Amino acid sequence: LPITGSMDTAYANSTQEETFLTSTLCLYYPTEAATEINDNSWKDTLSQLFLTKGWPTGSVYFKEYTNIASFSVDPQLYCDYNVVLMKYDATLQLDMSELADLILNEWLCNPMDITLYYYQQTDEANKWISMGSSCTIKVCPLNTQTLGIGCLTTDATTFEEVATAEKLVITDVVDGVNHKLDVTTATCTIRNCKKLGPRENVAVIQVGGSDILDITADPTTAPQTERMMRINWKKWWQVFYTVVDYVDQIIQVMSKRS
Amino acid sequence: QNYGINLPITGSMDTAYANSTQEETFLTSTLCLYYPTEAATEINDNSWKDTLSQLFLTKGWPTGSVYFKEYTNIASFSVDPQLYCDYNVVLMKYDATLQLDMSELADLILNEWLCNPMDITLYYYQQTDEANKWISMGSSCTIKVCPLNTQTLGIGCLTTDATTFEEVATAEKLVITDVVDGVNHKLDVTTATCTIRNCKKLGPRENVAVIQVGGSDILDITADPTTAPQTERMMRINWKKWWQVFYTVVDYVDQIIQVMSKRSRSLNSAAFYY
Amino acid sequence: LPITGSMDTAYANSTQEETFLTSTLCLYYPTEAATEINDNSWKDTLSQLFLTKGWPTGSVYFKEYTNIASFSVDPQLYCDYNVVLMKYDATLQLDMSELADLILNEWLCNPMDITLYYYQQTDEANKWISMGSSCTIKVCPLNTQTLGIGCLTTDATTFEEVATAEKLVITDVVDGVNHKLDVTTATCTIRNCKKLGPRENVAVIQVGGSDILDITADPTTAPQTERMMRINWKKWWQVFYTVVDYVDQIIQVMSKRSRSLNSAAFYYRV
Amino acid sequence: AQNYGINLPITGSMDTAYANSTQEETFLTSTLCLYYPTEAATEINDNSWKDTLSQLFLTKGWPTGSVYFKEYTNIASFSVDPQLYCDYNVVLMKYDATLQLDMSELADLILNEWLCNPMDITLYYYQQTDEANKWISMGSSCTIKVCPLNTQTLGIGCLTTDATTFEEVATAEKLVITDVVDGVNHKLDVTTATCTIRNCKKLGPRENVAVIQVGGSDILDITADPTTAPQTERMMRINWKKWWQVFYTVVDYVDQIIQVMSKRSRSLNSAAFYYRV
Amino acid sequence: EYIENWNLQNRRQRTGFTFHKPNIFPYSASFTLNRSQPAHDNLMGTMWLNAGSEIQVAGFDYSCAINAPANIQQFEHIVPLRRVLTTATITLLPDAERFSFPRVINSADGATTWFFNPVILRPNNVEVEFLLNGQIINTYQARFGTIVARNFDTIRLSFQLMRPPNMTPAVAVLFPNAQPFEHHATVGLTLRIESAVCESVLADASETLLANVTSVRQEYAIPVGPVFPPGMNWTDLITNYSPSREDNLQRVFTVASIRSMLIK
Amino acid sequence: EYIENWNLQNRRQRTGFTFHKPNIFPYSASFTLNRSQPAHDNLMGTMWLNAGSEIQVAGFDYSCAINAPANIQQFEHIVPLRRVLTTATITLLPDAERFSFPRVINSADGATTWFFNPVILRPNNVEVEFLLNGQIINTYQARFGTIVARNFDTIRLSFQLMRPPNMTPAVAVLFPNAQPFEHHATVGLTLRIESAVCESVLADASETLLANVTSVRQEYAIPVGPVFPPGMNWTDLITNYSPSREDNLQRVFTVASIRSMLIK
Amino acid sequence: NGQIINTYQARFGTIVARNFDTIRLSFQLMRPPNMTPAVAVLFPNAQPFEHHATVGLTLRIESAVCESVLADASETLLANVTSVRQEYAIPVGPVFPPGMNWTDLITNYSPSREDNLQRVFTVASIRSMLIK
Ligand SMILES: CC(=O)N[C@@H]1[C@@H](O)[C@H](O)[C@@H](CO)O[C@H]1O
Ligand SMILES: CC(=O)N[C@@H]1[C@@H](O)[C@H](O)[C@@H](CO)O[C@H]1O
Ligand SMILES: CC(=O)N[C@@H]1[C@@H](O)[C@H](O)[C@@H](CO)O[C@H]1O
Ligand SMILES: [Ca+2]
Ligand SMILES: [Ca+2]
Ligand SMILES: [Ca+2]
Ligand SMILES: [Ca+2]
Ligand SMILES: [Ca+2]
Ligand SMILES: [Ca+2]
Ligand SMILES: [Ca+2]
Ligand SMILES: [Ca+2]
Ligand SMILES: [Zn+2]
Known part of the structure; x- marks a missing residue:
């Protein structure tokens, strides 16, 4: 379809105000933020501050999470x-890369039955x-003969583990090689997902730290796009006010879901 | 505009690329930099200023044009x-806990700030x-x-008491407060030890060359999360001994000064008080 | 010759097959990888994974080290x-940059004498x-008078100390100024070296951490070159599998080394 | 709105027709500050003389918050x-008779633009x-x-190591403007604990301030040059019996005192990249 | 020449006007997105400038055919003419110069703007065909410089973008396999008709007859009639070049040639 | 044509020389900074190339009108001619191609150099006016392609840069509100006089008469006289095109036309 | 045409200029190195200058031959043209300035205005022969 x-042809007028009147955005803040916030009605407070900048009163929602792993x-x-x-934690170096690999990219996906198939x-x-x-x-x-390369196919201990005790794993093993894997499937589900492209309806604001996000798979590219942002964070209220102020720039580097 | 500002x-x-004026650049002018107290502690010489000043005298500068000024930390x-x-x-010197404070220091020093003082107990x-x-x-x-x-009532607080107010800065030297641009704000600043003012950002002060000794790049010297532009004068090196750092500065002063310009020098300080 | x-002219066919089948590939890993892998013949396993990518049956060599210092x-x-x-260490902040300076650049080097000349x-x-x-x-x-500024020519305590207890130093100091040295000659071996250009068969893969490596000691540039990659680790098996199956994009970022030296060291050539 | 550092002709x-009066808009826009010694506010005997004056400034044209009052203890402080x-x-x-260099050095700072560099006395000559x-200083x-x-770094009439052989150009003074002979390298012995000395260059006059000498004769020598003692437009002097006459005179003649000064030439946007503060 | 072609077309015989750079193309600067999305970060399609006697076309792919079959993306650009040109000398060069620098471009509906940062590959497998009534009269396969087209009224440019299979490390950083493409592959051609013989009247860079007609119609403040466009817009005159407008244009150009003989 | 215009100007009647791409513009490649500073990181103004029959102009703003009123920056470029052209066909295209790639440029005094990294917006609100004695003869508002200018001796191009109010995330990263602009907004036009009738003699791309005059004056090693520039510099001859130099140039071009009839 | 036809270096009185259309005056102010005490008080090194140094020249074209028509102090032809145009209350036309402003006529002295001015001055000379 060309x-x-x-x-x-003429530039149409700024349809930013209509995007404010129509869309529905929601920020995901950690729980230790809500510990340092110390208010019972800061949700209405911030949502009226969003009302100042054009968003109507039923357009902004506030959802929590415990940590990056949860x-x-x-x-x-x-x-x-x-x-x-x-929020940046220096101990978890790859967890933020895992979470931003998940949320910022489109994953067309299929399921995986570990017992039956290879x-x-x-x-x-x-x-x-997973x-x-x-x-x-x-x-x-x-x-190519379905013989174990450096392991025994009936021994689970000679298997070559790539992750343990982790919430979100994005496993990479070699392209053209057949594999058999072991999962404790009672507490974890794995599936093979291709990435079609990026999610334009999500952004990441790295609270503190440095630019660490290698959301690509290979080592050869570590590109920094427009929706991978970073702040410096002494107190939280400074950066809640930063988001409420520069929402006109943050929505500008994003796109509608449809 | 009495300097020919409206005229183009x-x-x-x-034009034939007339002359090269790097030596006239390095002749009548002055170059002074700030080093922490821990630097001169590890240096532990009584006359290392003489050593360095002779090494600056090698690199085009005359003798009486390089000054050394201490500071305790980035907070002080x-x-x-x-x-x-x-x-x-x-x-x-990089410190992971002193995270915003380095960005605050670079935000004040690198940019120009036209400032007017604020009266927090009287006005909004x-x-x-x-x-x-x-x-502040x-x-x-x-x-x-x-x-x-919009009718002067507190959003999620109470303007009569100070407990329900929302703090953005707890016991820090130099704050650049950013709030939302629409609404008015009631303020509690402990003015016995502080001085708060509003300040417009201008075309930046083109001289000051930030040299981050250690760490990685952290200096988000803008306000929005969208841009973190690592401009010309935010350099970074690594350290094991300070002598390597000062020898690096004295060696590459020819590269550092060509990245800045002395035409953007103010008169006394870095606050452009009206 | 120009x-x-x-x-x-027509684009030739993809010669990555002739590059795989007629060249070699060394992988260097710290011994912490060798103690987290915990297998006797995993070099066989990894090399049979390289064999799928077109590399021949014994044309991938593995060589170890303990840390960045050794x-x-x-x-x-x-x-x-x-x-x-x-592997990234926050305390090994500059020495990792020293090693990445030495292995990613061409240097002309002759020995130096310290007691006799300066x-x-x-x-x-x-x-x-050094x-x-x-x-x-x-x-x-x-x-010009060959007298020491801010020091003493005889007294070694009055010297200005640039590095201590360090395996590999690349001292930068000012140009056109005569310098007198104090190096432990019986242990340390020093040389002055001119940086010709880039050594171009080396990919440093910073396994963990952040991009810090300021190779060019000029502060005005921090060149993040093409062969300076950063992966983040939890298990090493992830890192080794990533190096195996993205091997074409890691040989693609290299070229053939073009310099005729004279030292004539050992090479694992096909 | 451009070409900030070029100096175009x-x-x-x-x-060209003469423009309009501009004085009412200058009174509505800008701000005024009046610095008085504390002996004035002693002899005035009021807490609300600031508001009385400010309503008289309202009569003269300024708004209520446009006229600021600060004070000082004496000329030295x-x-x-x-x-x-x-x-x-x-x-x-006020003209203290026994101090005459103090007021001249004070007006030498205040009525001039000073571009000043730091100093290190321990290192440099x-x-x-x-x-x-x-x-x-x-x-x-x-x-x-x-x-x-x-020309050999050997002192003329002074031992370079001894500090008592040195000769003093000022002692125990708050502000000192030192002029010495040009072209001769000098060693200093400033008490750096309670005094900072700086290498200054007089660019020109300061365009926003006048000095009213309340009582006492014409003494002001701005230019540290014996031949010229310039009497500029903003070295006014009046005679006093009470302070209320002085304050009513400075409030009555705002339209002359603001007239003999101008806006500060550095503080404009047009002097952007010529030493703006 | 004009009175000779007047007398030959008054008896219905074949005529030919020889033009140096004829204005056969109406001004049409536009584009086409074969692959697009509202993010505008992975686009594919052609852009063109048809102006005077010059076609500058450039097909771009942001992925540089990283998922196309055999790493080859086929582009195509078909320019129909209004009158049949005959015996045309045409300078065909690669690497269209106007569509080779970064620019921001409004969208199709004019709502938003999208960025275009081109790096230029050479055009692989150029096929320039000169169609008359759908039949291939002349064809040229990977031949640049001056070409000839003896009889045609449609120009079909078929160039393709091939991903380079061998790339130095300075090139391999430009085209990743992933999504962020800061450097976009772009392949162009330029086709300039230097001189051509056309049976109908046109305008070109040699004569001044259209200038004389517009000068007479603009000097005396003439109302817009039923045939010619308002203000004698040549783009709107060659966009809809009807035979009645052709007859009026030939008559008024012949009279303009007569007056240009007498009045200098 | 030359002896006809000789005989008509010997009786003081109106003449016209028909030129294909006349060399009416002297070579003037320069610029103008309406907003500048010694840092050269926030600049604003026009650049131009006047060469032969071609004007390529480009106004640039580094801020992309982020503080201009209504996000619109007005540019203007006025080219005075030396002789009055008549009935000129002019190809007016947008997007000046020469000022659309990154370059480093010496300053006005030639002291330092400044960098120019352009991204190209389209020219909003193009107004091309053809002035004769300060009076607007022809005007064209946002019309490209081939235009006509019946009588003029001044060309006034008035284009403006408008900041795009809707930008995709690939565009919004180019133009921040803060100071570091690594991508500079640039808007261009191109104006090429294809053919024109001028009462005075000129040089163009069709005749070879100036080439014959310079070949005769350079072959026999002729000293520089009182009228013509040294080496027959056409840029210095059309820069100061006095009526005595006009008479000498017309006489020597007429004799060159005579010799070009006899000697091939 | 940018070429130096005549030049005169520190020569005053009556000079001659044979062929020109641009006049370039290049004078310079030199501070006097020896000054009596009456002069040295005028020019301090400091800022307040109550006496300002000023250097001038005067250049008066007494007579000249011009190929185009002009006005001068000898003829009365421009006065006759303006007297006829002002006596009969004539509307402002397309060529000449309103009120026959000679400053606006010689500021923008176009060749069509030159031809009109020469024709009307010739007719004014004819009428000045007949009518006194
Ligand atoms: C331009 C457009 O798209 N429509 C309206 C237009 O009718 C109105 O005159 C203009 C005022 O600036 O505001 C626009 O929103
Ligand atoms: C099947 C065939 O024709 N093979 C050719 C091969 O001869 C040529 O060397 C190569 C270059 O990459 O291109 C292939 O298509
Ligand atoms: C608005 C303005 O400043 N211009 C007025 C002018 O209209 C008036 O005729 C004149 C009378 O003296 O006074 C000027 O101030
Ligand atoms: Ca195993
Ligand atoms: Ca894989
Ligand atoms: Ca609260
Ligand atoms: Ca704000
Ligand atoms: Ca020492
Ligand atoms: Ca060095
Ligand atoms: Ca003494
Ligand atoms: Ca002196
Ligand atoms: Zn031509």
Whole structure:
């Protein structure tokens, strides 16, 4: 479906005010934020501050999460625009990369039955995304004869584990090689998801720290897009007010879900 | 406009690239930089200033044009804006806890700030655009802000007492408060030890060259989360001994000064008080 | 000799197969990887995974080190394409940059004499590289009168100390100033070296952390070059599998090394 | 709205019509500050004389919050750090007869734009480049001792190691403006604990401030040059019996005192990149 | 020449007006997005400038054919003419110069703007065809410089973008496999009709007859009639070049040639 | 044509020389900074190339009118001619191609150099006016392609840069509200006189008469006289095109036309 | 045409200029190195200058031959043209300035205005022969 258009037609007027009157955004803040916030009616306070900047009174919602590990199991992102106040912890170096790999990208996905079948990467694009309370992936490769490469197929201890006790795992093993894996499937579900592209209805605001997000899979690219932002954070109220002030720029680097 | 500001200049695109004036740049002007007290503690020489000043005298500068000024930490350096000489380079040591404070120091020093003082017990205040901020300096002041309704009632607080006010700054030297631009705000600033004022950001002070000694890049010297532009004069090196750092500065002064310009020197300080 | 190529010439076929089948590949990992892997013949397992990607049956070599300090005492980069996998430490903030300086750049190096002669630096291209078990370098400037400024020529306590207890130092100091040295000669070996260009068969893979590596000691530039990658780790198996299956994009960011040296070290060539 | 550091030649016609009065808009827009000694507010005997004056300034044209009142104890303590803030400044100072260099150095700071560099006395020997270079020191107690060197770094009449062989140009003074011979490298002995000295260059006059000498004769020598003692437009003097006559005179003649000064030439947006503060 | 072609067309014989750079193309600067989305970060399609005697076309892909079959993306640009040109010398160059620098462009509905940061590959497999009534008269496969087109009324440019299979490390950082493409692959052609023989009247860069007609119609403040466009807009005159407008244009150009003989 | 215009101007009647791409513009490649500072990081003003028959102009703003009133910055470029052109066909295109790629440019005094990294917006509200003695003869408002200008000696181009009110996330990262602008907004026009009738003699891309005059004056090593520029510099000849130099140029061009009839 | 036809270096009195259309005056102010005490009080090194240094020239074209028509102090032809146009209350036409402003006529002295001015001055010379 080719979409053509002239290169001297008029610029339409700023449809930012209509986007404010129509859309529905929601920020996801951690629980220790709500500990430092110390208010019972700060939700109405902030939502009236959003009312000052054009958003109507039923357009802004405030949802919580406990930490990055607890938010990593099923983030829903049901609003029109989404920003997450992803708080930097220096001990968890790859967890933020996992969460931003999940939320910022479109994952067309399929399920995975571990007992029946064997699995592999069709190209670079798909990964083994596993979610649950405790994911202990154990992958062993197989050759073209379905013999164990460096393991025994009936021994689960000679398997070569790539993650343990982790909420959200995005597993990468070699492309063209057949594999058999072991999951404690009672507490974790794995499925192979290709990334089609990016999610334009979500943004990440890294609260403190440094630019660490290697949301791509390979080491060869670590690009920083427009919706991966970073603040410096002495107190929380400064950066709640920063989001409420510069919502006209944050919505500008995002797009509607449809 | 009595310096020819409304009048346009007309270049010619084909002037012969007349001369090179790097040596006249390095002759009558002054270059002074700020180093922490822990630097001169690990240096532990009584006359290392003589050693370095002779090494600056190698690199084109005359002798009486390089000054050394201490500071205790980034908090005790930010108790007042002091930018002394013609060419300035500032040497901060990275600390992971002192995270916003380095960005606050670079936000004051790198940019130009036209400022008017604020009267918090009498009047109400707001911010006009992105450039308006509330810079507050002092020994220790807790800033408790509360927004206001359009009929002067407190949004989620009570303007009669100070407990229900919302704090944005607890016992810090130099705050750049950013609030929402629409509503008015009732303020609780401990003015016995503090001085708060509103300040517009301008075209930035083109001289001061921030040299981050250690760490990674952290300096979000803007307000929005959208942009963190690492401009020309925010450099960063790594340290094991300070002598390597000072030798690096003396060696690459030819590269550092060509990244700044002395034409943006103010008169006394770094606050442009009206 | 100037080459004069046309613009409308046809693109040749993809020669990554002829690059895989007629070259080698070394992977360097710290021994913490070897104690977290916990397998006897995982070099066989990993090399059979490389065999799927077109690399031949024994054309991928594995060589170990303990830490960044003990690898920088002599980085002997053996084979035709060298990836090094370097674990991030916040305390090893500059020494990781020292090792990434030494293995990602071409240097011309001759030995130096300290007791007899003393040396200066010509421009920003030459620096003073010193390797050994412990390099405590204490340097003092001089002048046309060859008297020490801010120090004493005889007294070694009055010297200006740039590095202590360090395996690999790259001392930068000012140009056109005569400098007298104090290096522990019986342990540390020092050389001055001119930076010609980039050593180009090396991918440093910062395994964890943040991008810090300021190679060019000029503060005005911090060149994040193409062969300086950063992966974040939880288990090493993730890192090794990522290096195996993105191997074409990691040989693609390298080129053939183009410099005729004279030292004639060992090479793992096909 | 551009070309901030170029110094372009203007071209104005000599047949342009004269603009309108502009004085009412200057009174509505800008701000005024009045600095008075504390002996005034002693003899005034009021707490609300500020509001009485401010309503008389309202009669003259200024708004209520446009006229600011600050005070000082004596000329010596005002001269510790004179930081003069607002758009139009005028200072009242009484002629103490025994201090005459103090008022002249005070008006030498206040009525001139000073571009000043720092100093380090322990390191460097300092020479003055030309006449507009002065050495301005301020603090609690300045005691400056100068040692003239020859061209070989050997002191002329002063041992470079001894400090008692040095000769003092001022002792125990708050602000000192030191002029020495130009071209000779000098060693200093400023008491750096209670005094900071700075390498200053007189760019020109300061355009926003006048000085009213309340009582006492014409003494003001701005330019540290014996041949010229300039009497500019903003070195006014009046005679006093009570202070109320002085305050009613400065309130009656606002339209002359604001007239003989202007807006500060540096503080405009047009002087953006020529030393703006 | 004009009175000769007047007398030959008054007896219905074949005529030919020889033009140097004829204004056969109406001004049409536009584009086409074969692959698009409201994010405008992965686009694919052609852009063109048809002006005077010059076609500058450029097909761009943001992915640089990283998921296209055989890493080859086929572009195509078909320009129909209004009158049949005959014996045309045409300068065909690669690498269209106007669509080779970064620009921001309004969308199709004019709502939002999108950014275009091109890097230029050479055009692989250029096929320039000169169609008359749908039949291929002349064809040129990967031949640049001066070409000839003997009889045509449609110009079909078929160039394709091929991803380079061998890339140095300076090139491999430009085109990742992932989504953020800060450098967009762009392939262009330029086609300039230097001289052509057309049976109908036109305007070109050599004669001044259209200038004389517009000068007479604008000097005496003439109302807009039934045939010619308001203000003698040549773009609107060659956009809808009807045979009645053709007859009026030929008559008025012949009279303009007569007056240009007498009045200088 | 030359002996006809010789005989008509010997009796003081109106003449016209028909030129294909006349060299009416002297070579003037320069710029103008309406807003500038020694940092050269927030600049505003026009750049132009006047060469032969072609004007390429481009007004740039580094802020992209982020503080201009109504987000619109007005540019203007006035080109005075030396002789009055008559009945000129002019190709007016947007998006000046020469001032659309990054370059470093010396300053006005030639002291320092400044960097220019353009991204191209389309020209909003183009007004091209053709002035004769200060009176607007022809005007064209947002019309590109081929235009006509019947009688003029001054060309006034009035284009403006409007900040786009709706921007995708690929565009919104280019133009921040703060100071560091790594991508500078630039808006251009191109104006090419294809053919024109001028009463005075000129040079153009069709005749070779100036080439014959310079070949005769350079072949026989002729000293520089009182009228013509040294080396027959056409830029210095059309920069100061006095009527005595006009008479000498017309006489020598007429004799060159005579010799070009005989000697090939 | 940008070429120096005549030049005169520190020569006053009557000079001659054979062919020109631009006059370039290049004078300079030199501070006197030796000054009596009556002069040295005028020019201090400091800022208040109550006496300002000023250097002038005067250039008066007494007579000249011009190819185009002009007005001068000898003829009365412009006066006759303006007297006829002002006596009979004539509306402002397309060429000449309103009220026959000679400053606005020589400011923008176009060749069509030159032709009109020469024709009307020739007719004014004819009428000045007949009518006194
Ligand atoms: C331009 C447009 O899109 N429509 C309206 C227009 O009718 C109105 O005149 C203009 C005022 O600036 O505001 C626009 O929203
Ligand atoms: C099947 C076939 O024709 N093979 C050719 C091969 O000969 C050529 O060397 C190569 C270059 O990459 O292109 C292939 O298509
Ligand atoms: C608005 C303005 O300033 N102009 C007025 C002018 O209209 C008036 O005729 C004149 C009378 O003297 O006074 C000026 O101030
Ligand atoms: Ca195993
Ligand atoms: Ca894979
Ligand atoms: Ca509250
Ligand atoms: Ca704000
Ligand atoms: Ca020492
Ligand atoms: Ca060096
Ligand atoms: Ca003595
Ligand atoms: Ca002196
Ligand atoms: Zn042509």
